[PDB]
């Protein structure tokens, strides 16, 4: 009975990990940050509304210049907007109308999309002669694509629904490194600011911290009750916030290797579909199934205002690298730029 | 502004091209096809003529799109909301697997799948077209095998008319909501016609109920 010995060993080893994490819990963020004054009420007004989509919007991503953004919808189109003047730079028709993710290259020459077809398609925006055309179809995943992020102009990391995250090579088209260890579907991921580590929330109510180069998991975080729908990375790079299906936001610390604060209110029971930080990391914007977007004080776990301008569920949310705007797509085929 | 006013009329030529292709998709009927792998979806697909397979066929100047998601093998609750809005769900169940097992017999695993799909929070007004394939072999099997293997509580003669009717009413029992949706059961043989016409009739009842919703009668 080697399995019984191995199973008992894991439980004994897990107890040591829990004891070590609790041994360093000298205080809490709420107790430490009692002194700091509240940020006060925040008023955000819809400065622009982008129209043109004829179906639900499942993903969006700001450009690195904080002016152009790409929105993916299940009407079969991938629209690139000019957020300053509401113009439409491009409208890319997809081969598969079931798209649940979108990405924008840091250089700006490429965009990516994926969905129920288990294929991540890279589109060339440079278009040396003509229009935007497909540059590569990265096949090899077993489940649906849930998130994709551009590490550089040649490397893209994708998380699929078959419990595996992958690192690709756009120029060649092969799986450079495969990340395994999850038990449920991987629903989201977030790259570090320095692009060396990335987290990945999964349906097994756990988030893991991977290493891009070596390809091995480093730290595993627990504490949620249901699936982790979305995840985001702190601007400093030593923390990350996750949003789960039981109406709660949790902030974890990489160095402390334990949960720091939780953002829950008894009046909210709707799940969370997106999280994102402000430029300074003080705010924590989160989207909900109750058609509303809430702004949380990260250092005080206090609600600081709501962004209610949508008539359906909020599915995607992002903050520009400039930090001067927030865009909130939703299922009613509308995008809104707040403040 | 000379190179800026020219960037606006390009945003307007893109705008009208989205409406032209957006009106085309409104004149199309989207159907979701489910099953238990070997239930007979392949047989049905040929009758009307990795990832998600889209099948296109037309009937009486009406365009049908039929998506199969039986090759996903993931958590259904995560991507099943993408199909919220289909006209009807074409459910295929094989009558010849009432005794075959994968443990659990193959007919019970279809009932469990049917229960989740029928009583899902996203599919409220979506009509379900339940097809019962493999009727030819099912008739022969009950002669030498008893239906009590699948349903112990069953008590009746081992006749095709009695056995088939008992199975059909067992599936409609699982529908907890008997007033918000209707199940159009049907019997399909290996070599049969008019199957596509049955789907056409079940979709028309959804279009009429959709049209009355626009005016206000519904």
């Amino acid at each position: 009975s080697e399995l019984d010995q191995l199973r008992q060993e894991a439980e004994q080893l897990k107890n040591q990990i829990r004891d070590a994490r609790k041994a360093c819990a000298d205080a809490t963020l709420s107790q430490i940050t009692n002194n700091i004054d509240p940020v006060g009420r925040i008023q955000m007004r819809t400065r622009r509304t982008l129209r043109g989509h004829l179906a639900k919007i499942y993903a969006m991503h700001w450009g690195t210049d904080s002016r152009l953004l790409v929105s993916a919808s299940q009407d079969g189109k991938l629209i690139i907007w000019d957020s300053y003047t509401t113009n439409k730079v491009h409208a890319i028709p997809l081969r598969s109308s079931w798209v649940m993710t979108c990405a924008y290259a840091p250089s700006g020459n490429y965009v990516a999309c994926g969905g129920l077809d288990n294929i991540c398609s890279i589109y060339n925006l440079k278009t040396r002669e003509g229009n935007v055309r497909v540059s590569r179809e990265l096949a090899g995943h077993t489940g649906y694509l849930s998130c994709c992020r551009f590490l550089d102009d040649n490397q893209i990391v994708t998380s699929s629904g078959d419990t595996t995250c992958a690192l690709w090579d756009i120029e060649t088209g092969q799986q450079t490194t495969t990340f395994t260890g999850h038990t449920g579907d991987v629903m989201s991921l977030s790259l570090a600011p320095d692009t060396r580590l990335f987290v990945s929330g999964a349906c097994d109510a756990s988030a893991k911290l991977w290493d891009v180069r070596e390809g091995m998991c480093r730290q595993t975080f627990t504490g949620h009750e249901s699936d982790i729908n979305a995840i985001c990375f702190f601007p400093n790079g030593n923390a990350f916030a996750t949003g789960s299906d039981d109406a709660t936001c949790r902030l974890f610390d990489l160095r402390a290797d334990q949960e720091l604060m939780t953002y829950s209110h008894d009046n909210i029971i709707c799940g969370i579909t997106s999280v994102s930080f402000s430029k300074s990391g003080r705010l924590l914007l989160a989207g909900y199934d109750d058609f509303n977007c809430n702004v949380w004080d990260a250092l005080k776990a206090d609600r600081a205002g709501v962004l209610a301008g949508h008539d359906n569920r909020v599915s995607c949310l992002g903050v520009t690298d400039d930090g001067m705007a927030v865009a909130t797509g939703s299922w009613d085929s509308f995008l809104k730029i707040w403040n | 502004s000379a190179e800026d006013k020219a960037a606006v009329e390009r945003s307007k030529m893109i705008d009208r091209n989205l409406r032209e292709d957006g009106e085309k998709a409104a004149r199309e009927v989207k159907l979701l096809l489910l099953g238990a792998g070997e239930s007979g979806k392949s047989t049905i697909v040929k009758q009307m003529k990795t990832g998600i397979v889209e099948t296109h066929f037309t009937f009486k100047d009406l365009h049908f799109k039929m998506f199969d998601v039986g090759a996903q093998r993931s958590e259904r609750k995560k991507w099943i909301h993408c199909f919220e809005g289909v006209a009807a769900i074409i459910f295929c169940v094989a009558l010849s697997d009432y005794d075959l097992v994968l443990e659990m017999n193959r007919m019970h695993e279809s009932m469990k799948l049917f229960d989740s799909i029928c009583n899902n929070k996203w599919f409220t007004d979506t009509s379900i077209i339940l097809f019962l394939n493999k009727k030819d072999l099912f008739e022969e099997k009950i002669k030498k095998s008893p239906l009590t293997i699948c349903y112990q509580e069953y008590a009746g003669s081992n006749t095709y008319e009695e056995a088939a009717a008992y199975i059909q009413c067992q599936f409609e029992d699982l529908n907890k909501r008997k007033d918000t949706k209707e199940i159009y059961t049907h019997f399909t043989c290996s070599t049969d016609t008019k199957n596509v016409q049955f789907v056409f009739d079940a979709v028309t009842d959804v279009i009429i109920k959709n049209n009355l919703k626009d005016c206000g009668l519904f």
Partner: single-chain antibody
Amino acid sequence: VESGGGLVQPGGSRKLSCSASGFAFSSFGMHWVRQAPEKGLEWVAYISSGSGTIYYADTVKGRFTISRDDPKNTLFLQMTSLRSEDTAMYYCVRSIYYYGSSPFDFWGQGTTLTVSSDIVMTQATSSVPVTPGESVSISCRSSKSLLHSNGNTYLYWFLQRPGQSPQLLIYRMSNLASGVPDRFSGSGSGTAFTLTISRLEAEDVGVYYCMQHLEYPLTFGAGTKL
């Protein structure tokens, strides 16, 4: 690529045709810039994408007529009444307009035919020593400020090697066109603009033109031979 055109004729009428080749002609606005046998370039006409806005030069407002046909990828220019002034070499130029686009990127081979207010660009310098291996700066001036409210100054720099069609080096104030080596640079202030070359090579010999894109009756700058 693109080529095609007519021939010479005495005081009559003729049709000019340009044939696109594999660059999605249906989404490109096309111009009909023309160049005199010895003088500089001069704008003639323009037709947008989808045959929307159409503009004409002051001297060819009524005599000329432009048209396009996205099927078969052909651009048409109809000329009815021709005087002794309209004898020149006619170029076809493509241009696409969005936020980060680079208009006037590709120029046609060009055809010649003989018959037998606005913003003016100064470009005072007209001759520079041909000595290579050093840095040469080309300056230009405009009648009115080319800086717009949005914040970008519309000024394009073209290079015309002797024998070939003009090529675009710098679109707008400083952005460098694709396929152009990094020795070219552009700095300006809204009315005064300069072009800088770091290391002159044998391939940089030619005539450098300027162009404005603020008001559509646009004008060139008579060139500057090196």
